[PDB]
Amino acid sequence: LTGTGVLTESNKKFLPFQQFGRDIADTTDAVRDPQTLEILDITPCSFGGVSVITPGTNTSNQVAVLYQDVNCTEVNVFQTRAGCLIGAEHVNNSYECDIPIGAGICASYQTQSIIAYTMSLGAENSVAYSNNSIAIPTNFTISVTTEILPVSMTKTSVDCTMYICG
């Protein structure tokens, strides 16, 4: 039984006859040492997606790295509900989300260096509510907003025969 993983002392209540156990996917999860009456849980070696956070190269070539759904152990560091962020400074001030990461964490490039932060939803504004007060306009403005909407695609056609058996 070949594989790759981390073998750890298990707390599984293996029976005297059970040689090893499997997970839902029909893959091994714990084994019995052939030379020792000991059970060992198998955990696949820490892996995880790797994403690159960067402003435009037209601006700078200075970047940061996100290791997804991992701990800052197997790898200016920031632990987040998304993973481990490297090369970005943790900042208390909240700003508009420029480069989204996750769990409310967004990043940007500012005076220079790259920063990560908890994104800000918007300006706080309490309202002077009372049962005898009303705010009424004395003036106005004529605003013009732009709304873009796709309507049509490229009328592509393909000859299956010529594509395959040209």
Ligand X SMILES: *[C@@H]1O[C@H](CO)[C@@H](O[C@@H]2O[C@H](CO)[C@@H](O)[C@H](O)[C@H]2NC(C)=O)[C@H](O)[C@H]1NC(C)=O
Residue ranges in contact with ligand NAG by CB under 6 A:
35, 58, 71, 73, 92, 128, 130-131
Quick one: what does residue 71 bind among ligand NAG, ligand X, another protein, none, with the CB cut-off 5 to 8 Å set by partner type? ligand NAG
Q: Note whether 99 and 119 are within 8 A (CB).
A: no
Query: SS3 for 162?
Result: helix
CB of 56 to ligand NAG, least distance (A): 7
| Strand ordering across the sheet containing 39-43 | 6-9, 39-43, 28-32, 20-22
Quick one: what does residue 15 bind among ligand NAG, another protein, ligand X, none, with the CB cut-off 5 to 8 Å set by partner type? none
Q: Note whether 42 and 6 are within 8 A (CB).
A: yes
Q: Kindly list the residues in this chain that would bind another protein in the complex (CB under 8 A).
A: 2-4, 23-27, 44, 47-49, 68-69, 81-82, 97, 100, 102-104, 106, 119, 121-154, 156, 158, 160, 163-166
Q: For 164, phi and psi rounded to 5 degrees? A: -85, -55
Q: Kindly list the residues in this chain that would bind ligand X in the complex (CB under 6 A).
A: 138-139, 141
